[PDB]
Design a protein around this ligand. Sequence first.
Ligand SMILES: O=C(O)C[C@@H]1C(=O)Nc2ccccc21
Ligand SMILES: O=C(O)C[C@@H]1C(=O)Nc2ccccc21
Ligand SMILES: O=C(O)C[C@@H]1C(=O)Nc2ccccc21
Ligand SMILES: O=C(O)C[C@@H]1C(=O)Nc2ccccc21
Ligand SMILES: O=C(O)C[C@@H]1C(=O)Nc2ccccc21
Ligand SMILES: O=C(O)C[C@@H]1C(=O)Nc2ccccc21
Lengths: 320, 320, 319, 319, 319, 319
Amino acid sequence: FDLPLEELKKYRPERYEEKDFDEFWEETLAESEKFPLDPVFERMESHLKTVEAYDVTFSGYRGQRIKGWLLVPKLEEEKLPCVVQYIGYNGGRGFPHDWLFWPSMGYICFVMDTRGQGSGWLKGDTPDYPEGPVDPQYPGFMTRGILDPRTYYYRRVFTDAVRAVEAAASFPQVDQERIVIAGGSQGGGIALAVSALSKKAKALLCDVPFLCHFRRAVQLVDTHPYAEITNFLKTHRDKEEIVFRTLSYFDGVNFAARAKIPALFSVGLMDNICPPSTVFAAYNYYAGPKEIRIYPYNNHEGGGSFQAVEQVKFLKKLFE
Amino acid sequence: FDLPLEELKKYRPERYEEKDFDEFWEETLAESEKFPLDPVFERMESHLKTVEAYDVTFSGYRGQRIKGWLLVPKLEEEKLPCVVQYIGYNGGRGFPHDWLFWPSMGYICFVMDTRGQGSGWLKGDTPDYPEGPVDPQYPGFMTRGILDPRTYYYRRVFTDAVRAVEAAASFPQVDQERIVIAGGSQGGGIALAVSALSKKAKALLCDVPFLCHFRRAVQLVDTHPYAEITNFLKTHRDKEEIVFRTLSYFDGVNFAARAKIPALFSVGLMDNICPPSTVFAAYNYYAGPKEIRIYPYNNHEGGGSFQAVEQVKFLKKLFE
Amino acid sequence: FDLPLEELKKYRPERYEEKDFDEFWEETLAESEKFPLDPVFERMESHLKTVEAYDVTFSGYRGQRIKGWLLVPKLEEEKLPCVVQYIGYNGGRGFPHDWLFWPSMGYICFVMDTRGQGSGWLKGDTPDYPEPVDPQYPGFMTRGILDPRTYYYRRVFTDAVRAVEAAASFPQVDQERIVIAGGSQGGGIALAVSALSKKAKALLCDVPFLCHFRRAVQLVDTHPYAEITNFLKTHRDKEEIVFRTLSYFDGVNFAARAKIPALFSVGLMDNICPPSTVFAAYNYYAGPKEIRIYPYNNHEGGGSFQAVEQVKFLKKLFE
Amino acid sequence: FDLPLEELKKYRPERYEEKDFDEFWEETLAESEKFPLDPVFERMESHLKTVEAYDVTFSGYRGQRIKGWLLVPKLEEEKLPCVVQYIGYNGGRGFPHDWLFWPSMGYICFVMDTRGQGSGWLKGDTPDYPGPVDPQYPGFMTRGILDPRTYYYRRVFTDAVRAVEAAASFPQVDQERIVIAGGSQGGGIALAVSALSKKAKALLCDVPFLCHFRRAVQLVDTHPYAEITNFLKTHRDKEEIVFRTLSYFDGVNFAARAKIPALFSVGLMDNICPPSTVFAAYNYYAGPKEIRIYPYNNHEGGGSFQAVEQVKFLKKLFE
Amino acid sequence: FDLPLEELKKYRPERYEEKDFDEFWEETLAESEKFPLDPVFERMESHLKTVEAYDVTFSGYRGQRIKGWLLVPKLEEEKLPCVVQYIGYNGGRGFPHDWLFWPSMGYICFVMDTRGQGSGWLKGDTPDYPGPVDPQYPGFMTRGILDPRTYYYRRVFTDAVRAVEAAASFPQVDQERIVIAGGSQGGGIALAVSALSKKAKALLCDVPFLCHFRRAVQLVDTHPYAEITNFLKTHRDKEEIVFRTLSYFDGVNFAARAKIPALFSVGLMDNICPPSTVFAAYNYYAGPKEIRIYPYNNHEGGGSFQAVEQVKFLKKLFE
Amino acid sequence: FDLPLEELKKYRPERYEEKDFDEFWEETLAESEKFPLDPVFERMESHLKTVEAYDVTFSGYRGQRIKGWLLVPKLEEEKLPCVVQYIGYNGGRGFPHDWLFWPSMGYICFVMDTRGQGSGWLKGDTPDYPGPVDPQYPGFMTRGILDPRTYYYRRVFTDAVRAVEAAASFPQVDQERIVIAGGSQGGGIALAVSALSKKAKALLCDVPFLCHFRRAVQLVDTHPYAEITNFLKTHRDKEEIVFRTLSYFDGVNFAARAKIPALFSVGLMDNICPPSTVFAAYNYYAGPKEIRIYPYNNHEGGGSFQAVEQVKFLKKLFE
Ligand SMILES: O=C(O)C[C@@H]1C(=O)Nc2ccccc21
Ligand SMILES: O=C(O)C[C@@H]1C(=O)Nc2ccccc21
Ligand SMILES: O=C(O)C[C@@H]1C(=O)Nc2ccccc21
Ligand SMILES: O=C(O)C[C@@H]1C(=O)Nc2ccccc21
Ligand SMILES: O=C(O)C[C@@H]1C(=O)Nc2ccccc21
Ligand SMILES: O=C(O)C[C@@H]1C(=O)Nc2ccccc21
């Protein structure tokens, strides 16, 4: 349904961002750095036998306390590499046993809970906090605070996500040389922002990323969650310019252009949640060393368990 | 798809409410009455010629400033009857010209904007304000603050709505003894709440009501917006009892049981958004003088323009 | 899903029409004009308080008696501007209270009931009368389609022309300020009247239907355009005749003849009336014109926002 | 989705008809018999080799001229049994070769075209003739529904009775072995003819439509029964008048009067013609009768399996 | 939804086949020729009166016994032309009375049952006989797809070549007028036979399936092509193996080799067999050829209109 | 959409099985046990660090070689309890890392690959081995359904009984602490194993499929149950035969014979495995049992909540 692959590979749409993109993010991170990180780990009673699981609490956007899980495989290694895992839309940190892949592969896994979501396919425990009034919005998170980048939901998520990397680095068994940032769909869009904004992340795993190239996304598909923005615009007919202005500060394409760490991307050519031209726009602008795995017959599931093996091999080759 | 009509007409399921239902509502309304109502009626340059439209502002839940419209038909009579109109889900106050029916029929019309919504089919101008943290929720309004009645979204909307009647009553040209409360679907549910909670309403028009008999609604249909609650529960599998205890304080069946003012209901027997059994549970418990117009072949549109004429005739008879 | 906006704005494709288009319509109107208009306005008992409602009857196609409403706002004015309102597919005149917008804005509103429809979303009271009723697919789009002389829209468009003469006959109507308006089917009817009427002074044309039929069926499989496609799936031998008939009714061909000022609207995600069909008509429209473009709306177009634009537009025009 | 089979078999709900049901039909048929039948059989140049095909024209309702095909298998016998075939909703007579089953089984087949339809899945050549064509929902189900004298099926069912007279006029037809047959709309028409024709000798009634309307619209939201629901959703003041009209055309009411031997079929998962509507009709049917029950089939019913059952049923019936 | 027609007419994509395409088919066919054909025609008791029906069995792929019907019109001519009919996806030979068209037009019809299918819209009676039956997606499209030697259509296409020899062996068949025919799956089978058989005289290829697989799975998400997509969505490591296997069975590669006169049909709105897949095959077809193009039709194609075109085409070819 | 919870808890429909049910299974398992099990475990080079992964091969139905995974957590305890895991419809054994749950909780996990499937959502490596593969609807539900001796699940259920013996042969498995587990198709397979094998200590049976087939096809039209309905729609003469065969594989009949303690789960909104089908099995389940009821869940059931419940249930059992 989207551009053919030869064209996708060359797709570099003209970017749109405001003159103060970097200032906005510098100011955002400085204001939240005023609150102590205060990373707290507490060992959890669980039935897990090959992993030690910890409850995590750390200060994200403006000192607000975000939950997570830390999963440490029980191995002979002194320091271990770490994957910081960001979660898809409507998900949250779930149970420790929802995240066994990375620890089973010998990586500590830091799972960041997603403020105010956690109700659509995996439970969450962390609330959101608005900057004052909660404006008229379409159901969901995509238009929550959208009339101002200062009030916009993902300002708070992305800042949480940057602070999560610091929280993971605070656990002493984490090898700070081998902290990886990872996610699919919303988790991939979050990881992309972090790849530009964190100075602690060493590598990026970005699958079927959401939050990329919003302007094109709403022209290409009518699926959720991108349709929340379309549906908001269908009603608020006078707000096009302001909505896209706000979104430009959170667009993965604009972060990709600033990001310098090694990355492995994946895309499903039949994905109609995250259309391939949106994924390719981000990939093509990504300024670090990069590869992409392309799945021509997959929808939003992308490479699934095959991609998971690709990630393990990529990281092994990168860190050796 | 629902019970046959002969059974709908007798359907009076055991009600479920907590022992402190009334006290919850007394304390809520009392806390909000500590702020001055401070109703403002500012003439809005519209292009209307047979109606004068005022931009309304008034203090609803916890003094929060709620928007509305006040439309006055161009008639001499020093005191006119008044319809206070509440709005369907994802709607908001829109433009003054969106509400010309009741003014054209000789009634002043007070249209209350809906906090936080106004983004699905008609625009709105009024924000919500949470009680502190914005808990994990499913997209929309149905599960916003659902883990505690003190935090639940409809606490705030219902309080706004009671206060809206007071605001309408403040307008010098409104006949304080001919104040009707009205709405369809979400608007119907809010009106039904108001019909129990306000001391100032003279009659109820309650069309295809939503927010009624939640526990059964979600068994019968999988449509939105009731599906937001199902979908929350599909994830938060441990929260059934808490969710339904919270919803009990906002259930139109429990309000119907307390309401004493005359009412005209309507129902579409093929309505799969507000199932017939949910509307009939509310209607059958409704404690005031009452009549119901039944539309056997209609879905959620109910009686449409036909029902509007039934309303005009009902009020004329009542007020003679 | 259709051409990008930069291409829609330049989209002026080769028009298809027969050499006798104007003669067809001159002969149609002249034949119907032999019957007296006989416009009848019967004041009616109503619950309305700010508006006076009249039941209307007038002679449309071949003297057939078409219903309407006339809604007159109660204002201290010896003459008032007037909007002649045409109705969307499967609708009809409904109740007087269904049409309160234009009277509330200070316009007399003449609502024309639509022959034979009135059964999908708003009730109607006017029958159709055929020229035999040929084999057709369910609906109105293919009724009489094998010959322009028998086609359903010959009758509707005649009715609609006659409606404006009927409105002009009400004494309080300001004949310098008669507006023709409609959305979707209403807008396709309005485009035809904008070419054919001797009485209309402005056009409001929203998300128009009955435009560029040959391209519409290639772009969408929605109804009501799909009635045409489904007819042709069965009558495999009738492609050329069907498009020949439709060319006499195509809003793109009317637009090219129309001279009055116009305000259009279009939803770029409208899959009932695709944007390239709407832009074909708008771009060929020969009078002074403007268009409001709603990039995120489907067939609802600009909704209540566009209603505000209309009132502003007519106020400027007529001041 | 409907009643379980044990209950369907006992389902014999209270019938609804007006006091003048028989009078309505007697006068309808009397009036149409005033016009000469004038059945015209024109040998049609054909590529067919085992069958002789004829173009048929005959006088149906009020003398209106209806098309058909006559297909005669090339056999030695002087007189042949005959199946009068009625056609499903949105179909028409199509081509001669569309109807080869019955001829191949040694039966002359008279295929009646369906007035005004012919545009959904197979083409047709016969027009309808109404005077005013009232507001209606798209299609045939609500055409003229506010009065049984104007209703579309009054004309179809008359045409269908006249068809049997026309088939019987063909010299090679054995008038002792005239079968009336159809599926869905075809079946509902055949059910009416089983009560109204004095010439039909046996009925093949598959997955019948036009039965138990009031219950059909409560059970399913499919077309074409949904045309009726959608008309009532708009004309909310007309529920009584619509069902009164429909009572004169209801297969259940015809079934109670029909005397000829019949073979029915039903699909238990058919959501076009719900099984309760079909069993209501079957259970009231007053002639010698059998029903083939296909529990896993939708509207296709027994398909080719049923065709074999019909052949066997008629062989045994006719000795 | 596909290429516009002017581009379809010129669509001649680079073909993909392995170096050993012809050798694979020569060895396949030589191996199956080592088993005796042993055509068996058992005359059946039938209700049919204009046609003689035979129960057919013959040896297809590797001596496996395949069912069929032979329908002989009762005609004075002692040698008759013959159409060997292949059946659409999920069908099978059904009953003899399912196949009356060609015998009514004076052709012997040999209907080939389809191994292992017969369970979706018409029953069948013939099993498949594979070795191990590899992991597969539900259906026939992926059965044995990891190796052309194990692939399901190797066996169907061999059956189909053998069916033409079985038809030829019936004494009343005129071996100079054997036609091979099908639609959709039947048309892809017929197209393979048009390249592989030395006995067929003409090809009727309607809306052909089993063409240009690589592109089909990009254009549509419908079944049955979506079985291939779904297999690849799971077996993410097997893209190259899958399309290599499929290249031995692609109608486009057979069309390039076929020499006999052909009449194709295509529906421009067919989203089961997309127009670009059909035209790729049609444009490579190396024999004398024509195509009937149905711009408004989906997968039904020309339906009964095309059946007429077929009968005319063969009459002209053979006279 | 199904019975209310109060009725589901009381739903014990009359069972249907043939008089030779036990004999059929006795002979089936005896014939397969004549071939050596020959379990082979090969340590796999793996990226996994907390788990030792082994490629498994073993003899299932009639010596046929079935793949699997053996996942051993790296722990001190020399003899570990073991969960034998059966896979959902269209799945297969996938990668070792797809099955980390049970090993992470301290259990050796034996994952049985599913013959012939492995192509819908997780890839598989094991073929099926039928002679003739009868006419069937796409998928596995109707493969060999005309005889219980040839039916697909005869083979799978035998494989699954043999998997328990193959897990028991691994030296680090505590052969006295083996559990059988599955969701949907995996739950139906585990249920059969709960009746057929004497080795298992406990059953984990989530949203079970393969239960109460006769009722399943009346209640939902979803796949995979709809493959059966679809087969019956065409093979209209095979209802009795199809249900007789299925009675030998019906989870409700195996439940009646199972004695080991069980934890079931059910989604009350599951329209793949309807609640009445799951309750019919659960209600007839003869051993100590409990059911987790998820009223707001569809076929996902309890998901990770249910997994926690399983870990607790086994912990109590093996203390
Ligand atoms: O894609 C994600 O970010 C998670 C999840 C998912 O994977 N698909 C989808 C679609 C709509 C809403 C939420 C979801
Ligand atoms: O029903 C309402 O309260 C308003 C509106 C409506 O009329 N139906 C519907 C369905 C889903 C969301 C919103 C709506
Ligand atoms: O578009 C119209 O003319 C009215 C109405 C409408 O607004 N959409 C639609 C689609 C199908 C039939 C009728 C309609
Ligand atoms: O059922 C019929 O009478 C004919 C045909 C048919 O077989 N099904 C169906 C459904 C809607 C419209 C028309 C049809
Ligand atoms: O197209 C065919 O070969 C037959 C039949 C058909 O006509 N369409 C279709 C689609 C899916 C499966 C089977 C079919
Ligand atoms: O339910 C299963 O056994 C697995 C999988 C599933 O979870 N749902 C579903 C539906 C159709 C085919 C296969 C499946």
